[PDB]
Design a protein around this ligand. Structure first.
Ligand SMILES: Cc1ccc(O)cc1C
Ligand SMILES: Cc1ccc(O)cc1C
Ligand SMILES: [Zn+2]
Ligand SMILES: [Zn+2]
Lengths: 194, 194
């Protein structure tokens, strides 16, 4: 439903050699190509520095998709507004999202969201070049959620992966909530600065 | 155009959150998101380190798409083979290509090709993050042509931008030819090494 609706805002304009999602120009990019960039970045700047670059890239994508969802706001509930995010992420072929428990009220600054991630392109791309890892590896995907939800709520909303396919788990699972409700929220917020 | 022929190799499966072009998984990525990453890489590693990283990412994309083109060899001419490169580059929303002159024989190792680039995503976004540039800026786009053509020929075909919108130019213009037919071809080839 949310997919069908938002999918109509994705258009291919070959006569411009361009692709548009709402107001934003998009490119189709091979995950292998992004994966080899990630490898170079990790290999030369280190896992931590690379994680941040990607999280902030994901952050701007999410902010942009939130602007797009903001225009499509009429008739939609707060949850329906939130749902567009997972939907765009899915349309963009990034990940398949299933909302598990979602508590939102934008007026009241209420947000607590848990989501299932399946077929995370990031997790199964890190795998093909690093194998399994200690910490969660879907950095760009997390930044997108963070970006999208913070833009929607008009306040800092951070996300963490509780489990991730690149750690060896069967799925990625994420939790989003306001900066105040994270035990190390200040360290988390830092990663989103250049 | 044969954009039609290749269009059938692009399959969107939203009900799964994935996009495949031939046998490569793809994502739709906001050019503004790539722009932000590009900005951080320049500021942190310099113009030339970054240019290298993008050329190499583009190179990987090109090599993968030439693999797709090869499965569609059918009863195509060498030029018709060559032509799927520009077609894929246009399907992926990167740029629209116009051949000026194309001289190719894969068997004999001959290649000399000049093209127009219109509506370059990469030139357009570089200007938005840095302004007009001193030298051509469609790094990822050049690497793709290089990678695609080199993989198709089984020999190193390097491309250079003679003109670029990122420079104040009303369009981009490129020249591709074998390594040995460039005077500086050994220092150009260096950028394709991590
Ligand atoms: C809000 C949002 C957007 C995209 C996702 O993958 C997940 C979430 C939670
Ligand atoms: C070969 C090839 C591939 C992609 C382009 O944009 C241009 C050329 C010439
Ligand atoms: Zn993950
Ligand atoms: Zn250019």
């Amino acid at each position: 439903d949310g997919l069908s609706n938002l999918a109509r805002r994705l258009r291919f304009a070959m006569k411009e050699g361009s692709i548009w999602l709402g107001e934003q120009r998009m490119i189709l990019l091979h995950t292998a190509a992004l994966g080899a960039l990630r490898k170079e970045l990790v290999d030369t700047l280190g896992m931590e520095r690379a994680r941040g670059l990607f999280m902030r890239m994901g952050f701007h994508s999410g902010v942009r998709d939130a602007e797009l969802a903001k225009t499509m706001r009429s008739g939609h509930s707060d949850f329906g507004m939130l749902e567009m995010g997972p939907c765009l992420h899915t349309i963009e072929g990034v990940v398949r999202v299933t909302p598990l428990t979602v508590d939102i009220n934008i007026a009241a600054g209420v947000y607590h969201g848990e989501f299932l991630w399946e077929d995370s392109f990031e997790g199964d791309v890190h795998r093909q070049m690093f194998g399994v890892a200690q910490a969660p590896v879907c950095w760009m995907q997390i930044g997108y959620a963070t970006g999208y939800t913070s833009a929607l709520m008009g306040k800092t909303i951070l996300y963490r992966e509780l489990e991730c396919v690149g750690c060896g788990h069967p799925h990625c699972r994420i939790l989003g909530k306001p900066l105040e409700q994270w035990e190390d929220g200040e360290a988390e917020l830092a990663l989103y600065q250049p």
